[PDB]
Amino acid sequence: ANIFCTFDHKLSIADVGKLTKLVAAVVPIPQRLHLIKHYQLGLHQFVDHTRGYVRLRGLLRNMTLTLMRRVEGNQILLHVPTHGLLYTVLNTGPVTWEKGDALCVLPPLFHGPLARENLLTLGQWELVLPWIVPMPLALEINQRLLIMGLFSLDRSYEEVKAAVQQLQTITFRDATFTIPDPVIDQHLLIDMKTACLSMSMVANLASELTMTYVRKLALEDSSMLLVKCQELLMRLDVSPDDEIARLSALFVMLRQLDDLIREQVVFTVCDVSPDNKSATCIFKG
Amino acid sequence: MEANIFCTFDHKLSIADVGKLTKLVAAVVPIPQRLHLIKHYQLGLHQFVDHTRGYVRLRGLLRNMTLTLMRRVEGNQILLHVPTHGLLYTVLNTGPVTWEKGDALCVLPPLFHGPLARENLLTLGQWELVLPWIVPMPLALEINQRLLIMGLFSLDRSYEEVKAAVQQLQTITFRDATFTIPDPVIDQHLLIDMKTACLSMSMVANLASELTMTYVRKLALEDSSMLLVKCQELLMRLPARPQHVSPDDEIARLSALFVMLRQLDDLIREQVVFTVCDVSPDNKSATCIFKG
Amino acid sequence: FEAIFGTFCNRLEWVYFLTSGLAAAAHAIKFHDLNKLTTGKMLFHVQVPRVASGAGLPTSRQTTIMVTKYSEKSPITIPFELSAACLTYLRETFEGTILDKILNVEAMHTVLRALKNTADAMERGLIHSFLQTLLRKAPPYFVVQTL
Amino acid sequence: HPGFALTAVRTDTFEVDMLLYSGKSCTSVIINNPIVTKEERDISTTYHVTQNINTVDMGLGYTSNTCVAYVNRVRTDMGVRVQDLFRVFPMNVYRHDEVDRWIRHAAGVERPQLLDTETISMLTFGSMAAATVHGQKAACELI
Amino acid sequence: FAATHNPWASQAGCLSDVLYNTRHRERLGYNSKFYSPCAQYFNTEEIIAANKTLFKTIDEYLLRAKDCIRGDTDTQYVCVEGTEQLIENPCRLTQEAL
Amino acid sequence: NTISVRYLYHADHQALTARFFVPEGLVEFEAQPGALLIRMETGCDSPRHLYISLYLLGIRASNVSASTRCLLESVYTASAARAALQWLDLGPHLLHRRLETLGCVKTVSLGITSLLTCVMRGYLYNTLKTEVFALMIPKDMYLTWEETRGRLQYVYLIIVYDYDGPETRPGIYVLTSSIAHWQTLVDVARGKFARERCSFVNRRITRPRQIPLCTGVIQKLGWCLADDIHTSFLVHKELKLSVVRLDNFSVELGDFREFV
Amino acid sequence: MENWSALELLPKVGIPTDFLTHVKTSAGEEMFEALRIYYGDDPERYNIH
Amino acid sequence: FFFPVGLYLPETVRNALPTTAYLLNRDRAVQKID
């Protein structure tokens, strides 16, 4: 089993000399196929000048990852890893690695070239390789971005602008990052506008409805660990069809946000090549 | 561990009795024991048959059963194969639901479609072969949302009020297909799920940031949209907003809340088993990366 | 015996990639293994017809126009199966009984047919893949009449 | 008759059997020896026969041509019915209650729908695998 | 010969731009279950997304117009969005045929 | 005859070994192959990572017997644990992020810098398939929610977080069980840790500051037969200690799953 | 001709190619013919069984 | 496909203004729309 690509565009030797440096890469493929166009390669087919982040990962979640192997005349010899076997995956480069790190895929967010970014353009077309990042950096950058979708609604406060100035600088082993602002041109992204409502809606409905369901379980007794919780539910203080539809309006907002939460690992770091030019990893997913 | 399972029959096969099983080749078959030579009495979900007529209890007892793909009808034996983690094998459709490329699949207990094809496809002196459905993930979890909203809805209502929402709740619709769902109503397992559910709803209500819970009201005057008009009706019961708080606290106030967002949604969540790739044109067979 | 009934199962109809009239478009070349053939390029030497009637007009070219083209490899893979429980009769070379002999030749025909149902039947996908690439080579006619 | 005009666009999925044509020697192909993948034994020992075939276009020009030809059978019903905007936009309602219920009495719509996951999901995911619902298609009116 | 016909469709900000167009449909609740044939004709996205493929593929055919005997050494092969456009041929131009 | 490839290779190795250099102050007891490796996320730049044995976690664990803690207190008095208590003990009810399981040792070289092989997947065993090394759980740490032996029990490493006293003293729970469904494993965890599930509410009743987190974390480690289960005895540096052995233990390191 | 003969697949299974001719001799021909028709290998001679 | 309905017709019996339209189906029965 090997997956092939074809370049209908002519390949200048200067571009294939950068392409040979990609002995391996975590190239997404939307649909597994015996043969596929280069237009299907990368996240560039999903590129949007509007939605930005979140939609890039909600479409990336279904992508079939595949490593690069070898290159021939106007064609790529991609090879799909088997689960559990070791593979010499290339890094996307933002973060230096050390032994034992977890890894997971994230949408690209360039801040100039990354440590491993030889640009390759074939007439308007461009290849945006997905991030391979340690898991704690992914959960933290997701928290910073959802927090950016909260505070961006009211930019004007100097304490808030200093707040965004403080949270913008994530750090790691000799890292010096600066978080991109999703909310370009003042107006909120539609993805930030939806992801924030996905949590804030439950933040209101759970606060209003939590009493009625703990109520019937309060008179019942067992370990009675639940009965005490309502005393702190009271600290921050009637229709039938409204009670019906409202719960259906609850989980529909809760559920798509779970993709923003859970993030299955795809690789794990072991031995590290010098200057982090490559790293062996155990494929997963 | 074992790479394969075998079985033994009592009542003898005929032409149709072996042909219906050859029709089921390369299809999901749960087992509960994983012995090298399981008896047919232990085969299938029929061993969990319940005169009380439950459903969620069949699902929780189904949660621990091992899945094993069918293959090769040598005759007078099932010859099951044990799936390997991380690879792929072809899988026939069983549940009356259309499939699409790349969707997640999960195991769910069967329920009658309505017209009821009632094709047992196998029977003996009483024993039958009830194969659990393989269904797309959003359909697999939305029925859990129906059973859970059915549990919270049951409290403190008249029987006409108890069944008023049920006319919409038990008649789920998906991809033109429609399904009526018999329900346990109260089977303890729904209640213990309700206890961790409301316990999650309490902390999700309580871990929310003072600005995060207010964010809809901060957006309410900011914008005007019909989804926000639908947003607006739920929150209100019958304009000012505040802003404070140091920036650092949000990295904590949000972080632990993510665990509750899992713990609340975990009960409607189900473990994935299949990921379709090469859909068959005839809408029958479907190879799937990853297994149980 | 209380009753009798007939039975039958046909062999699949034969098709060959070369016997087909589509093969005239093909110029197939058997080869050991696409391993050393790493380069996708393939050179050609195009001669150019000339009209010498012009007294003052000499062709600039010697009519030896090299032309490079590009190869396109394509996998040809199908699932296949056989019964090892029936294969053991091949493994053990029985000879002791006429019904054992019928069981042996049954095992031989059922396994040889099991390979025959995939071997030359793969040429259905070879003709299919050849259409997959020949259709890629073909522009729509609406482009061509304006071309 | 009001002051309105109502054009109605209608997608139709015709099925086509295209013509094909090619040159003589045209493309040349090269076939690999059939290497077989001996998958791990498990009584029912499946094997994966495999091959690779290369192709090159020997013809300097477009030796092949292709064009639409003949309809075998339309799969579209070729029916006509108005789009159900009450179902296309479930969330919308008149701000008045009795007025909206009186409108539902004439439209034939039951009651306004509960929130659907397709609404919140397509709110962030702009549709193009969603292009092929494979459902019935019908006229879409335009003022 | 007329500069325009319907103000309520061709003009920016018309009811069609706030109806079938995706950029304003997102303000409303909507479902993908009911495909709208005309929704492609009011998008600011799909129209430009198809037209850019058309204007680029046409020049890509013109690069292949001459025979190799007279043009520069080059392959001659179908352009991308060539065979793929066949399903949407009336609408790849957004000409609304027939 | 010719091209007898079978003669060329001596044995295959499905195990995914990795070579990790270790400080000499931690090699004690770790010299036995059956022990977990767990990278620690030190906040200091030099070094940001620090491998630790699972036994090193027991000097601070609450559920382990205090008499065993009196023995472990005399063991690790070196460059390792004196810094480990300086760092991981400082962590506010955070270990699943600080810690990272990395399988178990295959072999341990000596010297001032004790490099050691450690499989991250598959069986761990001596070279040439001779001796079969076995995993060694600390005695008191092992437990089973079902006293009946199962046909095949996966092992898990829960990390309980108590919130009673002002200074958290998290417990550590290796446990084998035939359960293989995380949706039910959290359910059997619901009623057993009633004091811990009460403790997660018990911080909100007192201290809104500092977010409470998990009552535990669950991740796959590997499967083992009930006959493979053992409770034997171990010696290193004369300080004898019985241990819960596991024989033919395949390694399958799943990711941590936080939950309340 | 054929992309590959059925004989070529046999060594990949490890089954000798001469072994089938050994079956052709062991069958005695008289049984091999009637079973070759019963299995459908020779449609021109086919008769219902 | 696309089709008008209800159009006024720019230029003693007077014209009757359209209010309905008819089409054709796969059955070839006269389709109705109004």
Tab-separated table of C-alpha atoms in Angstrom, chain F residues 8 16 31 63 79 103 108 153 218 223 248-249:
chain	number	residue	atom	x	y	z
F	8	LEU	CA	20.627	-14.692	8.157
F	16	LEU	CA	10.078	-0.591	20.415
F	31	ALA	CA	18.409	-1.685	38.022
F	63	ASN	CA	-2.108	5.439	50.322
F	79	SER	CA	20.800	14.095	43.788
F	103	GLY	CA	7.287	1.999	29.396
F	108	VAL	CA	20.353	-1.364	32.761
F	153	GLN	CA	-6.977	-7.927	32.862
F	218	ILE	CA	-6.898	6.668	33.515
F	223	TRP	CA	-2.765	-6.587	29.279
F	248	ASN	CA	4.333	-11.794	30.344
F	249	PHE	CA	3.209	-8.161	30.317
